[PDB]
Structure formats: C-alpha cells, structure tokens
C-alpha cells in the first residue's frame, strides 16, 4: 500500500531552505529518524498549487524562512507536484482527488505508527493546494486541526459537491482568503462562494491595488498577506464583519461585540459560527499591509434648503503621536438637516485624537470664481468612532467660525467633551 | 517539578551493554533525541533491587544482551539506585515509595509530552524492584500494560496494605515468580502470598536444586529462569495449575482445559482470573531449564492380600526419538486391588511412547536373599497420560510374564491398543 505514493515528500531545515535533501518515505521507517522529525512540536504541510514551468515558484523559499522565524523548532513538510502540475488546467484539475488521498495515507501512517496526535497540523494551501488540502482531511481517521486556504481555485470547483471541494466540514477550523474574485458567476479565477468558517475579503475581493510578473499580480497577495502576518507577531491586522460590500463603504458596521472583528492570518481566534461569515478590511500596496479604520459621522444643518452632489472634501487628523493632513473623500447628495457617515483610513499611527480640520474645496480655478457667493452650511458636531480602540469621542467648535463654505478657510474642531 | 528525580535513568545499546553513557533527563528534551529513543517499538524498564556493594549485580549485563537478542530495535531503560540501595534493609525498605513515584513522574512526562501510548511498557522487577514497579503504575494517568516481578521482597511487605505492595490491581497483567519462599509466615525472604494474576511456584517454591555466591543461590533463579525463557523462543516451558503442593506430587492435576496450563516467562498468555492462581512445574539444575511431565496410573491385582510400604521401583521409557532407562520412584502403601498414580519427569525428548519396563528392586544384598520366596503381584494395565501432548495411551502385556516379583526379572509392556 506504499508504492502508489508518487507525489513525493520532503523536509527542509532553517539552514537549508531552497533544497530538497532529506526525503521522507511512507513505509520506510529508517528515514523518519534520518530527517530528525521532532515529535513534540507542530507540523506545517505546504501544498503547492498550479505551475507552468518545471521548478517551484518564488514564494516558497520565503514562506519556509518565515515559518522557521516565527515558529522555531518545528516541522515544515513540502509536498511535490512537478510530474503532475505541469499540464493544462482541466488536466491538473483531476489530480487533486489523488494527491489528497496520498496526503491522507501519509497522515494516517504517521498517526497509526508513531502515534502522532493529529492536533498540531497546519495544512497550508495555494489555489489548487487549498482544494487538495480540502479533499484531504475528509479521508483521515479523525479530524485535523486547521486548514488554511490561500485564494482557492475557482472554475471547475465552483457549483460542485461538498465532498469534492474545500468544504467547511473538512476540518475543525478553516479560514480562506479571497483576493482575486473578479468575474462572472462560474467564470472567476478565485472562488466567489464563502466556504470557510471565517471568510475574509481584503479590499472586497475584486482586485488589489498593485495591478509575466504583472500578470499574476493579485493572485500572490494571498501569500504576501500571510507572510506579513507571520512576521508581524506583535501587530495584528483586524478584519471587520459586515453584510455587503456596499455597506462597508458607508462605515455602518464597525462593531466589535458578540463574536465580531476577528484578526487576519496566523493570529486568528478560533470562533465557530452557524452560517457563512463574510469579513472585510482594507490594505496598502507595500510590505506593511496594515491600515487603521475610522468612522466619521457629520451633522449638516442650516437654513437654505439646497441639495448638491459629488462634492469633494479634505479632512485632517491631529493626534498625540503623529498627524495626518490631507486625506481626501467625497460625498454625494449633500443637503440640510441630515446625518451622513462614511469610512476613513490612513497609514500613520495617531494614538488619541485631539483636533480635526474640515475643508470643502472648489472645483473652479478661474479668477471669476471669487464672486457669485458660494454655498455654505452650519456644522455643529462630528461623532468619531475609532476602529480598534472602541472610543466614541465628540467633536465641536466654539461659537465662532462655525460656517463651512466652499473655497474658503476651513473650520477647526476640538475635543468637545 | 523536575529536580527531585535523583534516582537517575539510562539507556543502553546492543553495542555497549555494560556502561551508562547516554542518560535521559526528565524535563530536558534535547537528550531524548540524543539517545535515539525509537518511538515505534516497546520499552523495557529494568528496576534494580537490593545490593550491598557499590556496583551493579552480575545478571544485568546478561539480561540487557538477552533483551537485545530476543527483541531487536527496542528500548531497555536501566534505573539507578546506587545512592539509595547501599544501606541496611529497613532503610532501603522505605525508599521504594519514593522511587516508584519518580518512575511514575517519568512515565507521565513521556506519556504527556511525546504522546507515548503506554501500551508497550514492560516493568521488570527484582526483589525490591517488583515492589517498586508495584508502587509505580498506581500513580500513573492510566493503566500500564505488563509488570513482571521476579521473586519480590518478603519481610516488611507481607501483611501490608494493597496500595503498599505489588497488588493485582497495579497493572493490566502481572506475573510473579516465587523461587525462595521457605520459612515461617512473615519471616521469609520471598513473599508467600499469591499477589499476581498468574503465580508460578517452580519446584513448589521452597528451594531450588542447586544449593558468598553460594549464599544467594536460590534467589537468582528468578532471573536465570527468565533469561532462559527469553533465549528459548521456539521451546516454551509449560506450567501446570493445581491446588496444593502435595496434590501435584500425586499427579492428579495434569489437566489442560478451561484456562489451565499456561506458559512460563515471556511467552505467557494473557488470561485474567477471579482469584489467586497457583501454578506448578519442575526444573533442572543446568542452563536448559525444561523437563517433561508424565502421569502413570498403575492397577495392582492379585490374590494374596499383603500390604507393604516404602517399596522402590525402577521404570524405563522407550519411544520413537530416544529412550530413558533408569528413572527411580517410590510408592508407600502398596496392596492388592488398588489403583495408584504419581508424577514422573525426565530431561530427554521421547516423542511417542512404544514400550515400558517396570522393575521392583531388592533392598537386600546377601547371598541368603535368593530364598524365602519373594512377594509378587499380577499387573494388568498401565494408563499413561502425557503432559503437553494430551494423549492417553494404554499399555498391557501378553498372557505370559505378567507377574512382577521383587528381585526378579522385570516385566515389559507394549502398546496395547
């Protein structure tokens, strides 16, 4: 029963990360003590996804070093694919049902000879690798601990059966990233269906703000968002639970009570749910991928009832540690006696807020534009609710300069209570 | 919790059996992978008993080689005593309640860090070592598999409590030898009480037929009967269940049905019982310790009613492979119209019996003794029941020479049916 294991195995060291020296063989037991498999710690299994060349991709010799820097004295097993993945795509879409059985036989061998606990096994998966890890685990003697899927495959695995894809019953805790879900239903590269216990949509999941290397740009963010979560142990990147992509832009759903607002990546909290769990956050185009989240509610008031549209504002943020000066945002359908809310983000740490400017800029540039007296409003209060630290401050002004007018000097608000 | 472990530990190799090079340390985990503890096989723990010098005894560097010859690629852990055993005897009779707790802490550490099964652990014990292994096991997280006690301690551990000695609830299967149980109740070197699931009394347990080296002669037979059982894999030495020492000499209890007639030593069958289980066998004074067991029933018949006593007989055994010629036995209270039975043993393999002489010798030697016509009887049949191979043959003679007479020619019996 141990000659149909052509999908090989390997074990890599922190001193040698880019090679495949010490192999493991299912059935031969003189090699397990040859690769120095430490029987006390956890075990990472990294399953390779699709490829078109003969070698590995470029993210595996970085993910090996990241795992060996975050969790020292552990086990990272690299599964091999290079006689089965270099094909066309419906050809390699059928080999997952065999490679998952090979991995299941290997794990049952390790759990039935050496009495391995199967309680400290992470199953990392790329686009085909996530479905490989999903078809594994269901064919084990008991439940595996955690399967992490990084932007799984879309085309032939959507509309399929639950024992055929990465289903939420495959393990005890499954988290799935959804970086590249742009396209029609059934014709997308990533999968559009929520499949895990926790389902994170970074930037909504349509694309990523960085787009042959440029061709696969927003398909490698599901690895570069995980390497960053392994490196930044002390600083987690929270993700926020909402109900739709359009509602998160209005900022009505920054609520972190009753099993909401989980983390993203390795430091996620094991929380089970009853249904699909869509979660949201925003990112940045560089190697620190953390941004903060602020909610701003603005009360408009005045006398002259005049509606407008597509007005551009500029706001500042003045706090204890540092400051943010020229954040732009727009609001359509501004009018009197309303209460508007939106979402605001930044990449500079603030601390606790002190003051806040508010400028309503002018689209016109001509020397004509100083006349034809500009529209204005009477702003009383701004409610600000921070994202992580749940503080709800109140801002107001004095009984002077409380009149925002387009193309004029901005108002300045202070801490009001 | 890992600095009160002054009773050290060691692991020995088949290439180095008489030294203590690679130690194990409870708590320090860089040494478990240093001694190459194979996590797949079984584990032997040899607990040393009492001593009076500073070094080990002479049977441990033979038992190590015997275990490594019988079960290759296994684990033999030698427990150390040499700062606690070189004392007086009521001094070393109190340290077992500490060494057993140290061994229990070591086994719980191995079973709670490396997830060891605790299903393949043999606990070998000498005279104090058996009670050390008995006070261990009760203080483990679950039941250990098998504890073997080799002639446990007698004086201060008799009349004690069940959580204080080697009790039958200490493990899942416990076998105990009783080689040196001679003495008064409460004043014996070995223990006189049956304590195990299987309790074997070789030669009844009073002494052994081989009796400073000569002082401890019949206390080392409980190790030399186990080394022989490890070496002779293909040839087991059966032990026979009876009810008293006097009844086994009459041979009325050679019955091997309904969970009777188990083996002796390593090759014993796991059979649980409801009460104490006394079992019997005989041995020989040299390194092959196997003898066969034959039951002989003799029907006396005649006319002249004359009782006698203390008459000596000589019998022969003629079989397929070899022959036994001059086996002596005696029978008191011989008389007409009776049926007598006894036990007979030998050390030469026979096979299947063919013929059997029977000679009733004369105590007198004088030239007078040919006269005063000797007493005689008329022997019809002899029922022979072999020990291992349950065959019940019937022997008889022809209708000539059927008259055994003292100091005359012997009768010769053949296979009768």
- End-to-end distance of chain B based on CA atoms, in angstroms? 73
Q: Do A354 and A316 touch, CB atoms closer than 8 A?
A: no
Question: What is the chain B residue with the closest CA to A112?
Answer: B40
Report the distance separating Cα B90 and Cα B278, nearest Å.
29
Q: Which residues of B touch A115 (CB under 8 A)?
A: 39, 115-117
Q: What is the Cβ-side half-sphere exposure of residue A246, based on CA atoms within 13 angstroms?
A: 0
Listed in sequence order, the residues at least 6 apart from A135 whose beta carbon sits closer than 8 Å to its beta carbon are A96, A97, A100, A101, A164, A165, A170
For residue B329, what are its two tokens? Answer: 């036995």
Q: Do B154 and B189 touch, CB atoms closer than 8 A?
A: yes
Q: Do A281 and A240 touch, CB atoms closer than 8 A?
A: yes
- The per-type count for chain A, helices as H runs and strands as E runs, is 6, 19
Q: Do B48 and B81 touch, CB atoms closer than 8 A?
A: yes
CA–CA min distance A120, chain B (Å):
12
Question: What is the chain A residue with the closest CA to B34?
Answer: A36
Residue A137: helix, strand or coil by DSSP?
Answer: coil
Classify residue B39 as exposed, middle or buried by CB count within 10 Å of its CB (0-12, 13-18, 19+).
Answer: buried
Q: What is the CA radius of gyration of chain B?
A: 26
From residue A3, alpha-carbon distances to A7, A25, A26, A58, B249 in Å are 10, 10, 9, 31, 60
DSSP letter, residue A256: -
Report the distance separating Cα B289 and Cα B347, nearest Å.
9
- Is A199 annotated to bind a ligand? Reply is no
To 5 degrees, how large is the angle CA B223–CA B224–CA B226? 65
Question: Residue B409's beta-bridge partner residues?
Answer: none
Report the distance separating Cα B297 and Cα B143, nearest Å.
47
Q: Using a CB–CB cutoff of 8 Å, tell me whether B72 touches chain A.
A: no
Question: What is the chain B residue with the closest CA to A42?
Answer: B114
- Is B170 annotated to bind a ligand? Reply is yes
Q: CB B115 to CB A117 under 8 A?
A: yes
CA–CA min distance A16, chain B (Å):
21
Q: Where are the beta strands (DSSP E) in A222-363?
A: 240-241, 278-281, 292-300, 311-319, 323-331, 338-346, 353-360
DSSP annotation string for A201-246: EEGGGS--TT--TTTTGGGSHHHHHHHHHHH-SSS--B-EE-S-HH
Residue A364 CB: number of other CB atoms within 10 A? 12
Report the distance separating Cα A343 and Cα A360, nearest Å.
17
Report the distance separating Cα B352 and Cα B384, nearest Å.
11
The sign of the CA dihedral A331, A333, A336, A340 is: negative
Report the distance separating Cα B235 and Cα B264, nearest Å.
11
Report the distance separating Cα A147 and Cα A151, nearest Å.
13
Report the distance separating Cα B378 and Cα B395, nearest Å.
14
- Is A4 annotated to bind a ligand? Reply is no
Q: CB B33 to CB A38 under 8 A?
A: yes
Q: CB B116 to CB A115 under 8 A?
A: yes
* Closest to B198 measured CA to CA, from B162, B233, B173, B165: B173
Q: Which residues of B touch A39 (CB under 8 A)?
A: 39, 114-115
Listed in sequence order, the residues at least 6 apart from B365 whose beta carbon sits closer than 8 Å to its beta carbon are none
DSSP letter, residue A16: B
Residue A396: helix, strand or coil by DSSP?
Answer: strand
- Ordered by start, the domain boundaries in chain A are 1-281, 292-417
Q: Do A356 and A395 touch, CB atoms closer than 8 A?
A: yes
Q: Which residues of A touch B33 (CB under 8 A)?
A: 36, 38
DSSP letter, residue A30: T
- Is A275 annotated to bind a ligand? Reply is no
Report the distance separating Cα A59 and Cα B165, nearest Å.
62
Q: CB B39 to CB A39 under 8 A?
A: yes
* Closest to A57 measured CA to CA, from A212, A208, A189, A206: A212
Question: Residue B331's beta-bridge partner residues?
Answer: B311
Q: Using a CB–CB cutoff of 8 Å, tell me whether B142 touches chain A.
A: no
For residue B401, what are its two tokens? Answer: 């020479």
From residue B213, alpha-carbon distances to A33, B47, B217 in Å are 44, 22, 7
Instruction: Report the 3 state secondary structure along chain B.
Output: CCCCCCCCEEECECCECCCCCECCCCCCCCCCCCCCCCCCCCEEEEECCCCCCCCCCCCHHHHHHHHHHHCCCCEEEEECCCCCCCCCHHHHCCCHHHHHHHHHHHHHHHHHHCCCCCCCEEEEECHHHHHHHHHCCCCCCCCCCEEEEECCCCCCCCCCCCCCCCCCCCCCEEEEECCCCCCCCCCCCCCCCCCCCEEEEEHHHCCCCCCCCCCCHHHCHHHHHHHHHHHCCCCCCECEECCCHHHHHCCCCCCCCCCCCCECCCCCCCCCCCCCCEEEECCCCCCCCCCEEEEEEEEECCCCCCCECCEEEEEEEEECCCEEEEEEEEECCECCCEEEEEEEEECCCCCCEEEEEEEECCCCCCHHHHCCCCCEECCCEEEEEECCCCCEEEEECCCCCCCEECCCCCEEEEECC
The sign of the CA dihedral A361, A364, A367, A371 is: negative
The sign of the CA dihedral B67, B68, B73, B79 is: positive
Listed in sequence order, the residues at least 6 apart from B123 whose beta carbon sits closer than 8 Å to its beta carbon are B45, B47, B133, B136, B137, B144, B146, B147, B148, B171
Question: Residue B194's beta-bridge partner residues?
Answer: none
For residue B136, what are its two tokens? Answer: 């261990």
Q: CB A40 to CB B114 under 8 A?
A: yes
Report the distance separating Cα B157 and Cα B153, nearest Å.
7
Report the distance separating Cα A28 and Cα B38, nearest Å.
14
Classify residue B53 as exposed, middle or buried by CB count within 10 Å of its CB (0-12, 13-18, 19+).
Answer: exposed
Q: Which residues of A touch B114 (CB under 8 A)?
A: 39-40
Q: Which residues of A touch B36 (CB under 8 A)?
A: 33
Provide φ and ψ at B300, rounded to 5°: -90, 140
Q: Choose the catalytic residue: A48, A80, A92, A151.
A: A151
For residue B212, what are its two tokens? Answer: 């400073």
Q: Using a CB–CB cutoff of 8 Å, tell me whether B307 touches chain A.
A: no
Classify residue B207 as exposed, middle or buried by CB count within 10 Å of its CB (0-12, 13-18, 19+).
Answer: middle
Report the distance separating Cα A137 and Cα A145, nearest Å.
9
Question: What is the chain A residue with the closest CA to B35?
Answer: A33
Report the distance separating Cα A338 and Cα B324, nearest Å.
119
* Closest to A301 measured CA to CA, from A333, A345, A334: A334
Report the distance separating Cα B382 and Cα B416, nearest Å.
10
From residue A152, alpha-carbon distances to A127, A138, A198, A209, A329 in Å are 4, 17, 14, 20, 34
Task: Give the residue from B40, B74, B116 with the most A CB atoms within 10 Å of its CB, the best one to mutate.
Answer: B40
CA–CA min distance A188, chain B (Å):
45
Q: Do B81 and B105 touch, CB atoms closer than 8 A?
A: no
Report the distance separating Cα B261 and Cα B254, nearest Å.
8
Q: Identify residues after which chain A is interrupted (C–N over 2.5 A).
A: 211
Q: CB A116 to CB B114 under 8 A?
A: no
Listed in sequence order, the residues at least 6 apart from A104 whose beta carbon sits closer than 8 Å to its beta carbon are A136, A137, A138, A139, A140
Q: Which residues of A touch B39 (CB under 8 A)?
A: 39, 114-115
Classify residue A212 as exposed, middle or buried by CB count within 10 Å of its CB (0-12, 13-18, 19+).
Answer: exposed
Task: Give the residue from B30, B36, B39, B72 with the most A CB atoms within 10 Å of its CB, the best one to mutate.
Answer: B39
DSSP annotation string for A149-211: EES---TTTTT--TTTS--TTSSSEEEEE-TT--SSTT--SS--S--SSEEEEEGGGS--TT-
Q: Do A23 and A9 touch, CB atoms closer than 8 A?
A: yes
Residue A100 CB: number of other CB atoms within 10 A? 22
Question: Residue B315's beta-bridge partner residues?
Answer: B327, B358
């Amino acid at each position: 029963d141990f000659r149909d294991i052509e999908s090989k195995f390997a074990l890599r060291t922190p001193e040698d990360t880019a090679e495949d020296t010490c192999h493991l063989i299912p059935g031969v037991t003189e090699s397990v003590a040859n690769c120095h498999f430490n029987h006390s710690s956890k075990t990472f299994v990294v399953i390779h996804g699709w490829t078109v060349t003969g070698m590995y991709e470029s993210w595996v010799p970085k993910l090996v070093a990241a795992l060996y820097k975050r969790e020292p004295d552990s086990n990272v097993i690299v599964v091999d694919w290079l006689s089965r993945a270099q094909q066309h795509y419906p050809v390699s879409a059928g080999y997952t049902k065999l490679v998952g059985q090979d991995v299941a036989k290997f794990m049952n061998w390790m759990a039935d000879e050496f009495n391995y606990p199967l309680g400290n096994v992470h199953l990392l998966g790329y686009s085909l690798g996530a479905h490989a890890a999903g078809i594994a685990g269901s064919l084990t003697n008991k439940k595996v601990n955690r399967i992490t899927g990084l932007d799984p495959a879309g085309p032939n695995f959507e509309y399929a059966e639950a024992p055929s894809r990465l289903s939420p019953d495959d393990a005890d805790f499954v988290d799935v990233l959804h970086t590249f879900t742009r396209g029609s239903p059934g014709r997308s590269i990533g999968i559009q269906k929520p499949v895990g216990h926790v389902d994170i949509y970074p930037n909504g999941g349509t694309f990523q703000p960085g787009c042959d290397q440029l061709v696969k740009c927003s398909h490698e963010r599901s690895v570069h968002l995980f390497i960053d979560s392994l490196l930044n142990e002390e600083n987690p990147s929270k993700a926020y639970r909402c109900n739709s992509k359009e509602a998160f832009e209005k900022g009505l759903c920054l609520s972190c009570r009753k099993n909401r607002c989980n983390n993203m990546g390795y430091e996620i909290n094991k929380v089970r749910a009853k249904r699909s769990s869509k979660m949201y956050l925003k990112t940045r185009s560089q190697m620190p991928y953390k941004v903060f989240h602020y909610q701003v509610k603005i009360h408009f008031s005045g006398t002259e009832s005049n509606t407008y549209t597509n007005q551009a504002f500029e706001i500042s943020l003045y706090g204890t540690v540092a400051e943010s000066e020229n954040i732009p945002f727009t609001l359509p359908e501004v009018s009197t006696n309303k209460t508007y809310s939106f979402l605001l983000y930044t990449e500079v740490d603030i601390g606790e807020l002190l003051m806040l400017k508010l400028k309503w800029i002018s689209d016109s540039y001509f020397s004509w534009s100083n006349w034809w007296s500009s529209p204005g409003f009477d702003i009383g209060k701004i409610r600000v609710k921070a994202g992580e630290t749940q503080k709800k401050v109140i801002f107001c002004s004095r009984e002077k300069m409380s009149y925002l007018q387009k193309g004029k000097s901005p108002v300045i608000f202070v801490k009001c209570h």
